[PDB]
Amino acid sequence: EKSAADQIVDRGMRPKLSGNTTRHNGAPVPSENISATAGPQGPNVLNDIHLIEKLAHFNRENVPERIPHAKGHGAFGELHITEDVSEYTKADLFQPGKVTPLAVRFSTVAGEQGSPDTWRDVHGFALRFYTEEGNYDIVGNNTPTFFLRDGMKFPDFIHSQKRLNKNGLRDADMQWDFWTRAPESAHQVTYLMGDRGTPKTSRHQDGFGSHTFQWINAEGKPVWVKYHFKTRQGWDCFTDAEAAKVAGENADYQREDLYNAIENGDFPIWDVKVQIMPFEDAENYRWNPFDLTKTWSQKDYPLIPVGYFILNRNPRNFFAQIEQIALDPGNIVPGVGLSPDRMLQARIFAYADQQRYRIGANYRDLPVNRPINEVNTYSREGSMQYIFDAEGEPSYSPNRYDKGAGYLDNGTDSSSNHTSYGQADDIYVNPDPHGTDLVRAAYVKHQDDDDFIQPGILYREVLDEGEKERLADNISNAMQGISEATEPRVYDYWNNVDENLGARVKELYLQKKA
Amino acid sequence: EKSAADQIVDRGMRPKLSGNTTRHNGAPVPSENISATAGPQGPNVLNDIHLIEKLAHFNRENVPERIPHAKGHGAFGELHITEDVSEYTKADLFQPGKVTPLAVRFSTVAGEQGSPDTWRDVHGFALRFYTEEGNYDIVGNNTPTFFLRDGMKFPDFIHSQKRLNKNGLRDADMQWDFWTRAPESAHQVTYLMGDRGTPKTSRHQDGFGSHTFQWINAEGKPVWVKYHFKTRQGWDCFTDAEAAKVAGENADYQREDLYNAIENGDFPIWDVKVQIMPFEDAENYRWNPFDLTKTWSQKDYPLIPVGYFILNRNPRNFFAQIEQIALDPGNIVPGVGLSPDRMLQARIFAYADQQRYRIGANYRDLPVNRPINEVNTYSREGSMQYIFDAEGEPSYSPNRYDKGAGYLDNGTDSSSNHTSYGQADDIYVNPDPHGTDLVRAAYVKHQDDDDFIQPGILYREVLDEGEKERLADNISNAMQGISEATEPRVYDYWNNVDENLGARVKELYLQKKA
Amino acid sequence: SEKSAADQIVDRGMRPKLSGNTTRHNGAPVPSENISATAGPQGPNVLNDIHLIEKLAHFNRENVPERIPHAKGHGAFGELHITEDVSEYTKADLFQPGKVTPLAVRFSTVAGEQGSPDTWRDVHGFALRFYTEEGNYDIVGNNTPTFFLRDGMKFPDFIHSQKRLNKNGLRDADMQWDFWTRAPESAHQVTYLMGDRGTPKTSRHQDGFGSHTFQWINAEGKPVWVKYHFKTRQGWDCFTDAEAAKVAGENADYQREDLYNAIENGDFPIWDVKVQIMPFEDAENYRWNPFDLTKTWSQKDYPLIPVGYFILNRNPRNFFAQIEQIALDPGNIVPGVGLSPDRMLQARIFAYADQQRYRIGANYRDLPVNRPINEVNTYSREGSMQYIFDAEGEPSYSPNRYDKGAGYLDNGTDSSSNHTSYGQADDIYVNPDPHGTDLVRAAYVKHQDDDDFIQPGILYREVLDEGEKERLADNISNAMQGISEATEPRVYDYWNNVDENLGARVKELYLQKKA
Numbered sequence A, B: 001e002k003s004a005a006d007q008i009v010d011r012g013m014r015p016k017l018s019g020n021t022t023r024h025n026g027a028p029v030p031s032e033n034i035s036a037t038a039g040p041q042g043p044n045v046l047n048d049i050h051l052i053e054k055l056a057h058f059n060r061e062n063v064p065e066r067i068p069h070a071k072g073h074g075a076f077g078e079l080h081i082t083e084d085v086s087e088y089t090k091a092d093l094f095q096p097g098k099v100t101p102l103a104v105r106f107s108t109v110a111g112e113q114g115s116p117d118t119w120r121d122v123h124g125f126a127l128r129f130y131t132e133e134g135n136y137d138i139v140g141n142n143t144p145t146f147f148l149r150d151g152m153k154f155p156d157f158i159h160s161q162k163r164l165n166k167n168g169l170r171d172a173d174m175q176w177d178f179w180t181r182a183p184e185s186a187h188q189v190t191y192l193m194g195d196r197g198t199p200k201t202s203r204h205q206d207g208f209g210s211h212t213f214q215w216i217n218a219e220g221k222p223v224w225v226k227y228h229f230k231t232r233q234g235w236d237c238f239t240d241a242e243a244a245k246v247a248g249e250n251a252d253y254q255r256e257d258l259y260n261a262i263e264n265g266d267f268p269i270w271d272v273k274v275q276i277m278p279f280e281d282a283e284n285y286r287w288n289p290f291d292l293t294k295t296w297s298q299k300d301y302p303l304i305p306v307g308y309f310i311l312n313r314n315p316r317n318f319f320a321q322i323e324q325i326a327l328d329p330g331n332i333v334p335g336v337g338l339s340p341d342r343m344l345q346a347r348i349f350a351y352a353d354q355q356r357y358r359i360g361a362n363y364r365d366l367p368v369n370r371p372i373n374e375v376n377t378y379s380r381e382g383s384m385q386y387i388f389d390a391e392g393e394p395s396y397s398p399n400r401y402d403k404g405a406g407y408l409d410n411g412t413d414s415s416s417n418h419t420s421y422g423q424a425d426d427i428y429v430n431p432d433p434h435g436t437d438l439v440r441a442a443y444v445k446h447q448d449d450d451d452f453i454q455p456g457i458l459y460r461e462v463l464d465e466g467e468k469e470r471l472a473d474n475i476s477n478a479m480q481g482i483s484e485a486t487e488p489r490v491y492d493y494w495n496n497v498d499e500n501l502g503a504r505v506k507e508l509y510l511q512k513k514a
Numbered sequence C: 001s002e003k004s005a006a007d008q009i010v011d012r013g014m015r016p017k018l019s020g021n022t023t024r025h026n027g028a029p030v031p032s033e034n035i036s037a038t039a040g041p042q043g044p045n046v047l048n049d050i051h052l053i054e055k056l057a058h059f060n061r062e063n064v065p066e067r068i069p070h071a072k073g074h075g076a077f078g079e080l081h082i083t084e085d086v087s088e089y090t091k092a093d094l095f096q097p098g099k100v101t102p103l104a105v106r107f108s109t110v111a112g113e114q115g116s117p118d119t120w121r122d123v124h125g126f127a128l129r130f131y132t133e134e135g136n137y138d139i140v141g142n143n144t145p146t147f148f149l150r151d152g153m154k155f156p157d158f159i160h161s162q163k164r165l166n167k168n169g170l171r172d173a174d175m176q177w178d179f180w181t182r183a184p185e186s187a188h189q190v191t192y193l194m195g196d197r198g199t200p201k202t203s204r205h206q207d208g209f210g211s212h213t214f215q216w217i218n219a220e221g222k223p224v225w226v227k228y229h230f231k232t233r234q235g236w237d238c239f240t241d242a243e244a245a246k247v248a249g250e251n252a253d254y255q256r257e258d259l260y261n262a263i264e265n266g267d268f269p270i271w272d273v274k275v276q277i278m279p280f281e282d283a284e285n286y287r288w289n290p291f292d293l294t295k296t297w298s299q300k301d302y303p304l305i306p307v308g309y310f311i312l313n314r315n316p317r318n319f320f321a322q323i324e325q326i327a328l329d330p331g332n333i334v335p336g337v338g339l340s341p342d343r344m345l346q347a348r349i350f351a352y353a354d355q356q357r358y359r360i361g362a363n364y365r366d367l368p369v370n371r372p373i374n375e376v377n378t379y380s381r382e383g384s385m386q387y388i389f390d391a392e393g394e395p396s397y398s399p400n401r402y403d404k405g406a407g408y409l410d411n412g413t414d415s416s417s418n419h420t421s422y423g424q425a426d427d428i429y430v431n432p433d434p435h436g437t438d439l440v441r442a443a444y445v446k447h448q449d450d451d452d453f454i455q456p457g458i459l460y461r462e463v464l465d466e467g468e469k470e471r472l473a474d475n476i477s478n479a480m481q482g483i484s485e486a487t488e489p490r491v492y493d494y495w496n497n498v499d500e501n502l503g504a505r506v507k508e509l510y511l512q513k514k515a
């Protein structure tokens, strides 16, 4: 019952201790039960050192929860490569036969800590691979798409899914007012309002990178990729009513399920697959290949196998290793790049920015966040600096010593004299930008790009009749509480997805409005 | 539609705005919808100033939640004095005819920010009165008693009610292991496991100061007091099953109920009453009068009316005025004092300590935390200093200027030359300390002091047959999941409360188990 | 080389020497430390230069709140060696015969901020940590046997008066003297401060003192009162007022640099560790209140008793990580050591950890320099930046059904109900008579010779040589420059109260320099 992740999860852990407790300076604790007073009925004294230390540290246990994805849980495990994808990527963890330790965190989106796992919501599906060339995180979701195509709109969407400023209540009118006024949301809202909005567990859902990313091979050739993590346990979903019943019975149903499964040796597995779009295919694809609200059809780009991952290790300490994990899509490694997906580009900034605040400036030094290789950096100081460089090493580059600089640099000067390095392939090999100016512009318009065609295809060509009916039923449930002003916007929105769906949504909504 | 609290709840509020949005420097925002790129398909530029500002501030929305009592909600209103209690207290807010603005926050204890209002739990009942001699907070609960008599044990109790370190799950075995090994808990556990563990709303419960406090009149004469807030709406409780059903239907049931009631003009009212124990009655009472786990019998000390309070104003902004309120039992005013209740004495330190961290060093300056009178303090600086003293005023006392010093001081020197002020009645007029040394000691033992007699009396003399049966049923439900190691300890604990209760608890537990 | 017993401690958290190329904080290779990525050579900077943003953002977060007070300081590591038998007086492990214990020290000024000169006239901090087998024992002392105040309520007043005016950010002579003359309990320490010892040349050329009365308790539980004295083997060596001010401009880090260089060159500074020991029963009848910080115990009544020595033989590996982030705290006591009814000390026992929780973070105790050598067994958990955590599944509460344990007075299995009592809290201190049964705000118990002026008067009349007496008056009159006309007579009276001849000379010199 060993795990490749054991090295990682044992970092920072004390041995088992017994006898008597100590204060934080190591001195023996007199009592955990009775505080010191000036006479049995006299006042508490200021100098009960343990009392104050115990209370003060208790007072500082809590830290800001994530916004969004506050409610979550995770595990550790292993990635196993079983295919040869070296033609497409030089990324070390993806080379033939590689086995790489991993962490994963699953989550909901809108609710706070302690909110139920089985509220209808997207679920986060966020992986870290502790690779030989650094931590590579694929911070995904249980959906191949998402609600928006521009990060500028992300805080609007998340406030609309959270609580009204006046009274701290979540609100149907607000959710639908936003969604109908941001019709790019239709693809993901259709997915969310279906059966997959309420998966039973974290084990019984697929995961996806959602965004288009780039793979680059040893020769520098790029291809566009999408990640699919296909559950070996299978999709398994509650109905709307079932999900609510479970929310009241066990708000931590999914957290408990994953813990139990691993504790019992029932290790969940996902097959890792990719869609691969040749660089030359992108401009002419029927949909914009970088628009997050557009999936690539699997009839055009079938899933290609890479390997599998398995979760075989529960955390040693939930707070230290899961609450404090700092999963970040900007944690890329050689052989992997980004794309002109504006949502992705905003994310590459946003996660580390939040983590610097939520955890601290030195969050990268915490056991679960350190890579397996040594970090060679000129960064220094900051709050709670546990790790520091070898004595006397330089704080600046270029310098006259040997600590070094970037791989493009010579290590000895500032690259003046008009030195150029060229295309920043490590970010991504870019396609045509279609303009020479700083602009605020639409995405390049491809033949079938609109806000409604893909969820309409889902409804008309993929869903069975039971799925179609449950979708309409779920939507009409989610509509209860909207204002009269919002009603026709919602009718119009669903009509635009499909006129039969829209008709049925309105029919059921009106029956329930009573 | 007016409230005395209007002055307070309007502090910090912007006027209604329209037109277009602005950045935080006041410059016009170009778009809330589209971010700037270098070409339509080019990379996002670093200098989309609004994008980064919007994302970065979004990233910092969350702050540490309270530990404990994270999940709560509140309102504002008025305290009205209707009786003359000036013979007992000189406290300004309690003088005849006085009408004082108030805030209140209600809460659960164990769960985090998103957790259901209707989990079985104690409910917090925390009041601020914005008096002419400062903010006076009575930070109470919906129970006249509590689980412990020494603050040293408080973090143990709260960890036992929260989540296991390994897996983030709450745990029955942990809750009962602590409760039965800390049998002082029996009084409150009996109250908690009865109907009152699941009140339907915040309006349908009493509130209590719980601790013994002190009242001092204009002549300096002290009496011991306990606060009772008697609901005019009446106690109204869910069954165990009903509370869980509601948790799944609406995790914010009580928050929503209070908001709706006030919005609809159905203003909830509580009658404010006190028990008053003469200073000379304390040593000879059948129970220790300062032990939080001991209530004063209302047969011995009947409720004496003081006035009523009414909640007639919802917050303008929930986060700003409720999440950020810093309710603190150390917020006492002239005419009110403490007592040798060790729990109370620990609390007088603990709340401000947490608030300095949870909110910030300058939390007292936030609109909802400022008193109505001007604060004259030598404190200065700290993070986010909004309010500062008049230009050039001195930073130290004693000084040669006019800002002043304490009311006991002369305003000109340091009170050297062996100056004494005598008894610190503003803290409390103390009873005998029963010793001359710094000690860790039991409370003074009164005739009927033990851990079990009071809940036994509740069971044997107060509860009706349905209440007694539901109590046993609730306990046996809450026991599901305890280890075989814990079972006999729990059987014994309940037998100590009452032999018939204990027998029924074991009977129902064994029926439900396996 | 030169080994140190402190090597274990100072090596904690240190990376090996690295070469080749730099990496981002996720471990991926850095393309450039020189050029940022743009959309075309003359195009805009792109958002997704991940290294650029990470480098700038972590740079932006390098600074942390400096200490208030004692912001400007520096330190080293070394060894405590016991050479005498004091076991009849204390059971404290580090003080037992033959014991060798690793140590840290930080020296400092008081009023100035992080960038301010080491040689401004000021008290100097002398703060020791001993990494003992029974926990970290810190003696957070100063280079004076006394201090300005006898009640912690007044401490923030004194420190604001030594810092900057609220309106304009300037330090101010009038404010300093207005406070001192209105708080005449300050006279003892101000006399010490204004003499030669206000300007020691280096950290090595000054004594250290615990200042407060502490308590020692032996194996049988018998207490004695003690004061610590750390007697420099290098000897007191002081600048004049003029010399110190010149050095302040020439090298603001004169003392920091001196200590670094001394240790690098193998010139390890040493102090002899001694105590005054006052029998418990002597306390009530001493001519001065033995718990009043403004009162020293005469060495004629209580001579210095030798204990051992300490030596500084190791420079820090990283100044910020090991010195700026050290959390020295007088509340870090160990078995065999206790407190006393010195109200300044009692306030300090609260204040340091309180500031450190803010200045560093909730989990500051887990940083390499702050961890003891023994394992910490605590039910505390979580908090920001939790690096260290308990063994998997260990309980978070006591009493519990497992083995993690509780306090040494507890039984480990219940809450000590049923009216359990443990008795006198000797680990805090064996208390003397409290002289009352009520919560009060009261003077200290008045001993025969207690006043605010006799002790500095004795220093002036019986201890100082003629040169010291004259330089004292000259230094005081220099420090008075800038006081208001209102403050002048207060200062004249204050010095007259110390000694009429000193007062006359102070006024003479002050008026010569004013006009």
Ligand SMILES: NC(=O)C1=CN([C@@H]2O[C@H](COP(=O)(O)OP(=O)(O)OC[C@H]3O[C@@H](n4cnc5c(N)ncnc54)[C@H](OP(=O)(O)O)[C@@H]3O)[C@@H](O)[C@H]2O)C=CC1
Residues within 6 Å of the ligand: A144, A191, A194, A195, A196, A295, A296, A297, A298, A299, A454, A455, A457, A458, A462, A463, A467
């Ligand atoms: N292309 C993609 O990456 C994905 C697309 N979709 C949706 O399917 C539509 C067609 O895509 P395309 O790949 O061309 O067609 P395909 O028929 O090849 O794929 C349809 C996909 O939809 C999934 N699916 C089945 N039931 C549901 C449901 N209740 N809710 C959400 N998804 C479900 C299928 O999973 P299964 O094989 O287990 O039946 C399958 O992955 C798209 O418009 C999109 O909305 C959904 C998931 C992935």
Ligand SMILES: NC(=O)C1=CN([C@@H]2O[C@H](COP(=O)(O)OP(=O)(O)OC[C@H]3O[C@@H](n4cnc5c(N)ncnc54)[C@H](OP(=O)(O)O)[C@@H]3O)[C@@H](O)[C@H]2O)C=CC1
Residues within 6 Å of the ligand: B144, B191, B194, B195, B196, B295, B296, B297, B298, B299, B454, B455, B457, B458, B462, B463, B467
């Ligand atoms: N003394 C006090 O301040 C209080 C005591 N108690 C409990 O009552 C016992 C007797 O106290 P005493 O004042 O001498 O006797 P009393 O008969 O005068 O008061 C009994 C109290 O118990 C309340 N009560 C009724 N049902 C329940 C229940 N389901 N769960 C919890 N409380 C309930 C009553 O409320 P109501 O009048 O509305 O029926 C009343 O306030 C105590 O041992 C204590 O456990 C409870 C509340 C306050």
Ligand SMILES: NC(=O)C1=CN([C@@H]2O[C@H](COP(=O)(O)OP(=O)(O)OC[C@H]3O[C@@H](n4cnc5c(N)ncnc54)[C@H](OP(=O)(O)O)[C@@H]3O)[C@@H](O)[C@H]2O)C=CC1
Residues within 6 Å of the ligand: C145, C192, C195, C196, C197, C296, C297, C298, C299, C300, C455, C456, C458, C459, C463, C464, C468
């Ligand atoms: N009792 C104590 O713990 C100390 C007292 N003092 C001062 O000395 C006075 C007499 O104390 P007592 O112990 O009875 O007499 P002692 O003669 O036994 O001791 C006098 C002390 O004063 C020190 N001293 C010498 N020059 C100066 C100076 N320039 N500035 C400050 N201190 C100096 C001496 O150091 P050295 O032996 O090297 O000459 C010695 O430690 C006290 O009122 C106090 O002000 C000062 C330091 C410690």
Ligand code: HEM
Residues within 6 Å of the ligand: A066, A067, A068, A069, A072, A105, A106, A107, A123, A124, A125, A126, A139, A140, A141, A146, A150, A151, A152, A154, A208, A209, A210, A211, A325, A326, A327, A342, A343, A344, A346, A347, A350, A351, A354, A355, A358, B055, B059
């Ligand atoms: C521009 C759009 C988005 C922005 C700005 C954004 C930003 C953030 C931030 C700041 C966090 C908190 C990170 C932390 O504090 O550790 C977060 C959490 C998370 N986000 Fe996003 N997000 C966006 C869209 C997405 C998308 C499209 C996905 C999936 C493809 C996603 C998946 C997740 C997941 C899984 C988490 C939780 C990670 C964990 O378990 O720790 N987000 N997001």
Ligand code: HEM
Residues within 6 Å of the ligand: A055, A059, B066, B067, B068, B069, B072, B105, B106, B107, B123, B124, B125, B126, B139, B140, B141, B146, B150, B151, B152, B154, B208, B209, B210, B211, B325, B326, B327, B342, B343, B344, B346, B347, B350, B351, B354, B355, B358
């Ligand atoms: C020694 C025992 C206790 C300690 C150390 C303690 C400490 C605390 C702390 C630190 C907070 C968070 C405050 C904040 O961050 O704003 C809190 C919340 C709270 N406590 Fe306690 N507590 C104790 C027992 C009690 C008792 C006996 C009562 C009732 C009589 C009580 C009622 C409350 C309430 C109502 C809140 C939430 C206040 C709000 O709504 O903001 N606590 N407690």
Ligand code: HEM
Residues within 6 Å of the ligand: C067, C068, C069, C070, C073, C106, C107, C108, C124, C125, C126, C127, C140, C141, C142, C147, C151, C152, C153, C155, C209, C210, C211, C212, C326, C327, C328, C343, C344, C345, C347, C348, C351, C352, C355, C356, C359
């Ligand atoms: C009631 C009076 C006093 C209070 C409230 C007080 C409080 C403090 C605080 C809060 C710090 C900053 C600690 C940190 O953040 O690490 C500090 C620094 C310091 N204090 Fe005090 N102090 C008092 C009097 C004294 C006395 C009498 C002495 C010496 C006997 C002393 C010696 C020091 C030293 C040496 C430092 C710097 C420690 C270091 O180098 O890190 N203080 N003081």
Ligand SMILES: [Cl-]
Residues within 6 Å of the ligand: A356, A357
């Ligand atoms: Cl920040």
Ligand SMILES: [Cl-]
Residues within 6 Å of the ligand: B356, B357, C357, C358
């Ligand atoms: Cl803090």
